[PDB]
């Protein structure tokens, strides 16, 4: 079945992806997992009282005492998420650059690739910070409960719920950072994003990422065959939630956002 030939590179690929992955992002899944269980204490926001007291105890990077904050928790929260998304786009861009061969793609296609993959890999990586009760925030300094989010007014309460539903099923796969490094790499190099004009060199890379992932999944998960196909089917699900997130943006929008994000959502799908 499986041999030990020049698959040494496949493993060389995964090591390289892991090493830049672990320094590209703040909180690895390993680290967040330890916080979600104890060994290491975030402030828990379950309450409007805990909210109002959370913004006091937690040091959010996007806020400064001198600036005007909207009297509107739903809006003060969207603010932080926008700031974090802007930062996440930059961290994902840096990671994309470390994927062997990416920087030699046509720069117009690197842009297209990053445009469609960012939020998918954002939702993928968000699960690493979630359990069934809530999600870690502020580099693990805070913890916002799932049920408090759902209680926010009007449509904002419907933003994070699909993400929780995704994370629950997705975390049951019990992937680790080493697996996550190669999976997001496979996401970024999706050769079926709309608007690509030099596909073949992208597919060639994705295949190398795909077979490196499969080999990684067999070596690291003896207790579950078909983990590979299950992940691929997850990439299908990540697209649907993006489609469902945009429609929600529209609802709110017809009732703004950082030029980088507006740049990303403009003419998406």
């Amino acid at each position: 079945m499986q041999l030990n030939p020049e698959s040494a590179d496949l493993r060389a690929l995964a090591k390289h992806l892991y090493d830049s992955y672990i320094k590209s992002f703040p909180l690895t899944k390993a680290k967040a997992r330890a916080i979600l269980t104890g060994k290491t204490s975030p402030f828990v926001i379950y309450d409007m009282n805990s909210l109002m007291m959370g913004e006091d105890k937690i040091k959010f990077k996007h806020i400064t005492p001198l600036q005007e904050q909207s009297k509107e928790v739903a809006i003060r929260i969207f603010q932080g998420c926008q700031f974090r998304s802007v930062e996440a786009v930059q961290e994902i861009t840096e990671y994309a650059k470390s994927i062997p061969g990416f920087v030699n793609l046509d720069l117009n296609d690197q842009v297209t690739l990053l445009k469609y993959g960012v939020h998918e890999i954002i939702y993928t990586m968000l699960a690493s910070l979630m359990n069934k009760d809530g999600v870690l925030i502020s580099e693990g300094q805070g913890f916002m409960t799932r049920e408090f989010l759902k209680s926010l007014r009007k449509p904002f309460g419907d933003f994070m719920e699909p993400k929780f539903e995704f994370a629950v099923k997705f975390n049951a796969l019990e992937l680790d950072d080493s697996d996550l490094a190669i999976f997001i790499a496979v996401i970024i190099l999706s050769g079926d994003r709309p608007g690509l004009l030099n596909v073949k060199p992208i597919e060639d890379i994705q295949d190398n990422l795909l077979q490196a992932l499969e080999l990684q999944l067999k070596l690291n998960h003896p207790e579950s065959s078909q983990l590979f196909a299950k992940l691929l089917q997850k990439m299908t699900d990540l697209r649907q939630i993006v489609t469902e997130h945009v429609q929600l943006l529209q609802v709110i929008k017809k009732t703004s956002l950082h030029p980088l994000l507006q740049e990303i959502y403009k003419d998406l799908y």
């Binding site: 786009v89 930059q90 650059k97 720069l107 690197q110 842009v111 740049e263």
Partner: peptide, 11 residues
């Protein structure tokens, strides 16, 4: 469009 993104790839 994609000028902010295009700029980040150029680094």
């Amino acid at each position: 469009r994609h000028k902010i993104l295009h700029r980040l790839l150029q680094e």
